[PDB]
UniProtKB/Swiss-Prot annotation:
To M.jannaschii MJ0977. Disulfide bonds: none annotated. Gene3D superfamilies: 3.10.310.30, 3.90.1640.30. SUPFAM superfamilies: DHH phosphoesterases. It comes from the Archaea. This is Uncharacterized protein MJ0831. GO terms for biological process: DNA recombination. It comes from Methanocaldococcus jannaschii (strain ATCC 43067 / DSM 2661 / JAL-1 / JCM 10045 / NBRC 100440) (Methanococcus jannaschii). InterPro entries: DHH_sf, DHHA1_dom, SSDNA_exonuclease_RecJ. Pfam families: DHHA1 (PF02272). One of its GO terms (molecular function) is single-stranded DNA 5'-3' DNA exonuclease activity. PANTHER family: SINGLE-STRANDED-DNA-SPECIFIC EXONUCLEASE RECJ.
Amino acid sequence: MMEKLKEIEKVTKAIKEKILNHYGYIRVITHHDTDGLSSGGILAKMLMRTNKLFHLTVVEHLSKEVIEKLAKENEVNKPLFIFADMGSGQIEEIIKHNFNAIILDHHPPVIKDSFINENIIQLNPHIFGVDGSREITASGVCYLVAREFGYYDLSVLAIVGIIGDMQYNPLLGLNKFIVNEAREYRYVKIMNDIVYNIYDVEIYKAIAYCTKPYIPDLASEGKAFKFLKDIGIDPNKKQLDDTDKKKLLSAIIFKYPKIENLLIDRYLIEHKVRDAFLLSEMLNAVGRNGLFAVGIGICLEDDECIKIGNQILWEYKKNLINELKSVKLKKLNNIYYFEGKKGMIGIIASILVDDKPVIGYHIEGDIAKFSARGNRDLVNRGLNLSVAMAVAKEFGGNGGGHDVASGAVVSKDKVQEFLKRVDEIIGEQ
Ligand SMILES: [Mn+2]
Ligand SMILES: [Mn+2]
């Protein structure tokens, strides 16, 4: 059990008092990812209810350049700064420039102290042994502050961040605590359901652009429409009922045998976007596109911001199916590999995993960047991609971490030799 929360609650009561007693400008810096926008929304709602006007800025990276610019505004009547999914790692520069500052972070800390001089407070649950890799997100840290004011309804946005940062399989620690609070206070219903019911669009559209999972023989409106018609589902239906689910699963198992991946615990939230999965996806797509303020408007439930969000999400999903259909996969005994576009190799690699591991790579300058990916059924059968990718050391290179995700870097001239060798090291099956 978590007496770690009692230790958390000491810092939250202080953050509350620091906000309640601050009568000047308040300045909120947050990130463009789902965890950042969610954090933005929770913070926005918390501060409006506490009668604080504030200026919200969304930032890609919190670099030295950006701290300096933020700092040039700290001479002119110094605002309280609230850093969201960031600040713990750049704290030395924040202390230097003498910001009146609150850091709400879950990235690994540089200073394992909550109270850093008068007028800096860092809430980073690593300091209490939580783990921002698996048990808490920024949305969640921001929610832990919101609770001190009695704003349990902001838990809905906390859950969006949990899904954003991929900390919902499995749901551990504080994240588990937050979801249970949201359920206790009636702001989320959790129910097992087929993945296609997340999108509240026509089922054939839900199936065609779905990448969780990506079933390639169904990845176009035509094929998905044919497939649904041939087994008696109204393809323009927006929710599959229990009878439809059976007909769908019964038939799809021939094209996609791992039925269990089509069934998901759905978070149904008290938010105009009724599905936390859908909201997470929407927020990520407006963030990818630099529509940060629209992002904040989706969190605040603006009808037009949501219409924009829906349009951008479905554009994003079409482009992603187009990029997947264009990958030239190459078989190699134990492994598929592909050459791909800078920034895309990892996300593509994880979507293309069925039976065997998948290594994507980009050739930039003198160097080849690999991203190797697998699944739980692959680690259970003996797979660790960390040891596989480490074989880069044999080619003058370096090789990455984790049993499913891992990367590597090798000279462009040694690609075919490296992949050959990573393939052999998957004798561990
Ligand atoms: Mn994050
Ligand atoms: Mn982030």
